[PDB]
Amino acid sequence: SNAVNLFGQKDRGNHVSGVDRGKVIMYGLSTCVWCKKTKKLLTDLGVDFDYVYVDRLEGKEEEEAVEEVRRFNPSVSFPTTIINDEKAIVGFKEKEIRESLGF
Amino acid sequence: SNAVNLFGQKDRGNHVSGVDRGKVIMYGLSTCVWCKKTKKLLTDLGVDFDYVYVDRLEGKEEEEAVEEVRRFNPSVSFPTTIINDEKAIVGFKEKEIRESLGF
Amino acid sequence: SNAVNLFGQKDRGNHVSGVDRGKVIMYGLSTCVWCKKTKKLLTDLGVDFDYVYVDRLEGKEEEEAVEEVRRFNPSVSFPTTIINDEKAIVGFKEKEIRESLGF
Amino acid sequence: SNAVNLFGQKDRGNHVSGVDRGKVIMYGLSTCVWCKKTKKLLTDLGVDFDYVYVDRLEGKEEEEAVEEVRRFNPSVSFPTTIINDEKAIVGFKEKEIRESLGF
Known part of the structure; x- marks a missing residue:
């Protein structure tokens, strides 16, 4: 699943249709090559994970x-x-x- | 405003916290007198709302x-x-x- | 006066050799055209003021x-x-x- | 690290909080084995220090x-x-x- 901010930009996704390895969350930026490479690794391992693009958040959500x-x-x-x-x-x-994810 | 966010983005709109009378979004333009007057009224009515300056969105988001x-x-x-x-x-x-907001 | 971060980049200045109008502080970003225009206005009014480039701060200073x-x-x-x-x-x-500064 | 800051800047170094034994700055390079070993030792000694990866600085700052x-x-x-x-x-x-840090 994914969520957008008020401006229509994707700010979070939750992949929850693969292997449950418990809570796994990547905080990244929408413009960050290494963040994208980390997302690709998590995708390629088949694990459930969430991601957040902190630069696409606003207000209390960004603070939190x-x-x-x-x-x-x-x-x-x-x-x-x-x-x-x-x-x-x-x-x-x-x-x-x-390794941390059990591979 | 001409202010930018932490991440350097121009003012595309905002969320004004208030009494939830539904998900209320004012679509406007960053310079527009009637938009400004409508945003001030919503502000004065104390309702929870968002405002978005469509002209400041990225293309695809502007279309949506x-x-x-x-x-x-x-x-x-x-x-x-x-x-x-x-x-x-x-x-x-x-x-x-x-009337539409239930006052 | 001015201060640099660990990386040698200017992160704050304090102009305290003009007209005392009390505490005046501009929070800006190092890459922000309107921030630079505001700094130029404060300079051209001759008032004492400080400025901070929040994107050049680190750790607790950035948080604060x-x-x-x-x-x-x-x-x-x-x-x-x-x-x-x-x-x-x-x-x-x-x-x-x-006007706020007494002009 | 390949991590970037909130503002998208590459890892140029950092401040490690500890016991003040002076203003201690380790000038290193982002890939350098002896640099890594020295940063780990300073970390293990519990001293307040900064480390800076000179190769990651902007030109003028690198020169300084x-x-x-x-x-x-x-x-x-x-x-x-x-x-x-x-x-x-x-x-x-x-x-x-x-010895130079006073231990």
């Missing part, structure tokens, strides 16, 4: 997304992929992502 | 907004204020706006 | 700047010029800025 | 960093760890790093 990223990644950098509310992976780290 | 307006307003003029994508007010028509 | 902007301007848009901790002006609004 | 390194290290190699722009350690030299 940044605070979530900062909690797990004080740099507030992208992508930040949070796995099972426990493990945060900053950047496109291919081996680390696949 | 146009089409949405066209459903209620075959001439495609601004402002057009749409409630729950079910009913609409064309122009600065204060008594129609109040 | 955004929170200050949000307090006065929930949109978190730029420029936001805060005059005497009381009056916030969003965007390049030439007449409003000069 | 180079010159700063050149003052302590006429060959201009990385890492060079500078304390209060007064003394420096060239390379991954653990005992020199500890």
Whole structure:
């Protein structure tokens, strides 16, 4: 599924038709090559995951997304992929992502 | 406004928090006197609403907004204020706006 | 005076050799034409003012700047010029800025 | 990392909070094994420091960093760890790093 902002731009997606590996969420930017490469890895692993484009959010939603990223990644950098509310992976780290997800 | 967001995007509109009387979206243009007057009235009525400056959207998104307006307003003029994508007010028509919002 | 971030980029200036009009601070982005035009207006009025480029800040400083902007301007848009901790002006609004500053 | 900040900038370095033993800046390069080893040691020593990847800076800023390194290290190699722009350690030299930081 996906959601748009007020301006019609996609700001979130939730892929929930593959393999359940619990809560997996990638915070990214809509203009971020490495974020797109991380999304492609998650897609190619077949895992359920959500993604958020923080630069497409507004108001309290944008505030809340940044605070979530900062909690797990004080740099507030992208992508930040949070796995099972426990493990945060900053950047496109291919081996680390696949291993953390059980591959 | 000529202000930009954190991410450098021009002012495309906004959400004004208030009393939920439906999903209310004012489609307008960034310079348009009747749009400004309609936005101020909605603001003065305290209703939850969004306003969108169609001229500031990216092309594809502008089309989606146009089409949405066209459903209620075959001439495609601004402002057009749409409630729950079910009913609409064309122009600065204060008594129609109040009645359609349930005041 | 001015300050740089860790990467050597100017992130703040304080002009304090002209006319004291109290605390005047412009929050802007380093890449923002209207922010630069606002800075030029403040310079041309001869008033003491500070400016901050929020996109050049890091860590807690960036967090604190955004929170200050949000307090006065929930949109978190730029420029936001805060005059005497009381009056916030969003965007390049030439007449409003000069009048608020006593011209 | 390949992560970018909110504003889309590549990882140019960072501030690691710790015990203030002076203004400590490690000038390094984004790929450099000895730089990584030196950053990990500083991290393990719990000292407040910054690290900067000179190769990721804009040109003028890269020059300022180079010159700063050149003052302590006429060959201009990385890492060079500078304390209060007064003394420096060239390379991954653990005992020199500890002694120069006052441990």
